[PDB]
Amino acid sequence: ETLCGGELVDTLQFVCGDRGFYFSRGIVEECCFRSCDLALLETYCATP
Amino acid sequence: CQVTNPSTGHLFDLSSLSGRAGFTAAYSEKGLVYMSICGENENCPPGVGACFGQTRISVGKANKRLRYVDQVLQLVYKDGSPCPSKSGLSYKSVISFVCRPEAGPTNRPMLISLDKQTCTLFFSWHTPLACEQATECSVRNGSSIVDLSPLIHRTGGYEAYDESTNPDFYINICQPLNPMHAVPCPAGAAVCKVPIDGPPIDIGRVAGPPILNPIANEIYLNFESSTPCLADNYTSLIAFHCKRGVSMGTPKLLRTSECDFVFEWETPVVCPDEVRMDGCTLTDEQLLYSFNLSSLSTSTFKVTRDSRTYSVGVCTFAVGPEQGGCKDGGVCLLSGTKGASFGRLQSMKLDYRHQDEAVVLSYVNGDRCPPETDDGVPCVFPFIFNGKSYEECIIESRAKLWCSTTADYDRDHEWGFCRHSNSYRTSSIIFKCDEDEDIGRPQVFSEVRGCDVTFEWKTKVVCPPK
Numbered sequence: 001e002t003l004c005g006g007e008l009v010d011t012l013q014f015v016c017g018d019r020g021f022y023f024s025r026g027i028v029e030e031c032c033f034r035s036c037d038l039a040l041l042e043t044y045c046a047t048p
Numbered sequence: 049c050q051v052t053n054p055s056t057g058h059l060f061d062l063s064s065l066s067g068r069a070g071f072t073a074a075y076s077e078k079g080l081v082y083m084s085i086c087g088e089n090e091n092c093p094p095g096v097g098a099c100f101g102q103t104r105i106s107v108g109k110a111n112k113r114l115r116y117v118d119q120v121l122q123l124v125y126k127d128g129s130p131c132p133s134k135s136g137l138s139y140k141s142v143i144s145f146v147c148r149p150e151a152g153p154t155n156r157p158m159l160i161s162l163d164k165q166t167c168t169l170f171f172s173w174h175t176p177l178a179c180e181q182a183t184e185c186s187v188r189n190g191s192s193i194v195d196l197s198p199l200i201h202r203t204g205g206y207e208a209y210d211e212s213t214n215p216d217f218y219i220n221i222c223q224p225l226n227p228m229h230a231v232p233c234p235a236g237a238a239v240c241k242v243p244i245d246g247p248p249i250d251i252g253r254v255a256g257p258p259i260l261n262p263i264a265n266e267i268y269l270n271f272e273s274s275t276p277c278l279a280d281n282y283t284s285l286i287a288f289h290c291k292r293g294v295s296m297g298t299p300k301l302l303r304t305s306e307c308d309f310v311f312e313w314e315t316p317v318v319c320p321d322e323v324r325m326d327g328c329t330l331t332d333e334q335l336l337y338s339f340n341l342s343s344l345s346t347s348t349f350k351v352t353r354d355s356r357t358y359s360v361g362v363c364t365f366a367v368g369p370e371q372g373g374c375k376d377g378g379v380c381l382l383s384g385t386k387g388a389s390f391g392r393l394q395s396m397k398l399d400y401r402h403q404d405e406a407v408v409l410s411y412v413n414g415d416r417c418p419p420e421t422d423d424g425v426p427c428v429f430p431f432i433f434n435g436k437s438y439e440e441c442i443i444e445s446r447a448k449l450w451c452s453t454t455a456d457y458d459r460d461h462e463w464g465f466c467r468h469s470n471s472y473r474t475s476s477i478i479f480k481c482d483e484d485e486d487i488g489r490p491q492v493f494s495e496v497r498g499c500d501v502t503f504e505w506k507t508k509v510v511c512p513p514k
């Protein structure tokens with residue numbers, strides 16, 4: 001169950017929001033090349 | 049699209065929101081949740097009631113499944129697009145409808161919080177459409193009726209003291225708790241417990257109107273539960289005292305009984321209307337004689353500075369029975385449409401300044417002081433937005449409650465997040481001597497944040513040692 005393209009980008013700001021997010025392996029490798037959870041997604045949210 | 053309370057048989061109609069065009073819930077900074085109620089949204093794919101931004105990522109299919117859950121009307125959008133987490137798991141949204149008798153702009157679907165694991169979106173919508181009973185908030189102490197209506201938090205809630213910023217409890221003492229950000233206190237809850245490890249738990253839901261103690265004249269207010277204790281239903285009780293002063297008080301915790309919760313609130317609203325000692329006069333033993341301010345108690349005055357048209361009445365209500373915008377208010381900041389009190393006439397105090405040889409009159413406990421942004425720049429009311437004028441912090445296309453810092457947002461796009469003050473408006477009049485001013489006129493001396501206004505009144509009355 002892959003999470004690629006703009007469908008990864010829209011999900012990033014849904015979790016991170018005003019905190020912001022990065023892309024640094026990388027997040028595209030962890031969630032698009034494979035499958036991740038939303039916890040392995042909020043690890044890429046920029047520090048509040 | 050219709051739910052009934054099994055106990056009362058009260059009909060709930062939410063069909064006034066069944067627009068297929070729907071409404072836009074706000075997340076992040078420019079995030080858009082195109083959503084609808086009872087029907088499918090138009091921006092989202094067919095069948096989908098709510099979705100995401102550039103891509104049409106569903107967070108649940110549209111249905112009529114409406115539930116009554118402890119004063120709340122829940123709507124469940126199930127079977128959306130698959131979510132990351134694990135195999136088989138899809139997105140879902142629980143859109144709740146909480147009772148709110150006070151109509152206004154904040155009557156929109158907000159995103160309170162989200163659970164990552166279960167892929168469930170918590171939604172809260174506060175409308176008078178979801179209200180069964182009235183706003184029972186007043187009790188009778190003899191012939192005079194005591195009300196708790198000013199103490200209603202209408203933007204969020206009261207943060208509780210760290211008994212033994214990181215909070216512990218959230219409290220709302222008549223209407224259900226208002227939806228905050230990132231803190232998922234179950235919609236409809238009155239008292240909320242937030243532990244360090246674990247989600248918020250419902251330790252309070254509004255039961256009935258306040259009860260009265262016959263002996264030492266205390267007022268109590270009960271808040272039951274919908275979730276069980278660790279020895280059986282939870283419960284929370286709030287006790288009230290009479291503490292006269294500038295502060296309106298805040299619900300503090302005193303006893304943590306294993307299945308109960310005791311909150312002690314010291315507030316001047318749980319005090320009777322005390323009739324003044326010597327009518328409308330001043331007496332200090334330093335001079336020993338009295339100043340008769342009853343000569344000024346004749347009528348209304350209109351002191352104005354920078355568009356702000358105040359109304360001052362020494363020993364008399366600011367605005368009379370005609371306009372009557374600011375009830376109890378001794379000073380009232382007029383707008384012609386709203387009005388805001390700067391101190392209840394009943395709370396009047398007279399003191400003698402020995403430095404300037406002046407007489408100080410002060411009212412207290414008016415309206416809630418104006419909100420500011422987190423940076424420190426005060427908000428500006430009223431402001432235009434898309435073609436509408438606004439009176440308080442709103443929530444359009446933004447997560448937390450925001451205001452404008454200009455007269456117009458559409459024109460200047462200047463804004464910040466609101467942080468509300470837990471203090472109420474005060475007003476004072478420093479009477480200064482002048483011999484030729486038989487019946488003088490007060491003037492604005494100092495306006496501080498709109499949270500305090502001091503007037504300088506020059507009269508003949510506050511003089512004679514001749």
Ligand SMILES: *[C@@H]1O[C@H](CO)[C@@H](O[C@@H]2O[C@H](CO)[C@@H](O[C@@H]3O[C@H](CO)[C@@H](O)[C@H](O)[C@@H]3O)[C@H](O)[C@H]2NC(C)=O)[C@H](O)[C@H]1NC(C)=O
Binds near residue numbers: 340343
């Ligand atoms: C402090 O000042 C006030 C106001 O001057 C004193 O009360 C006032 O006493 C006078 C007595 O001359 C009242 O005037 C009377 O009014 C009636 C109409 O109701 C009229 O028929 C009489 O001819 C007379 O003029 C006045 O109404 C009253 N104040 C008000 C406005 O109600 C007060 O006595 C003084 N404080 C002390 C030392 O007690």
Ligand SMILES: *[C@@H]1O[C@H](CO)[C@@H](O)[C@H](O)[C@H]1NC(C)=O
Binds near residue numbers: 189190266318
């Ligand atoms: C109720 O009224 C009496 C009047 O004697 C007063 O003493 C008491 O403080 C009042 N109780 C409260 C706090 O409501």
Ligand SMILES: *[C@@H]1O[C@H](CO)[C@@H](O)[C@H](O)[C@H]1NC(C)=O
Binds near residue numbers: 273274281
């Ligand atoms: C608490 O008890 C009442 C009946 O007294 C019940 O209706 C309610 O569901 C209970 N709360 C829980 C544990 O769900």
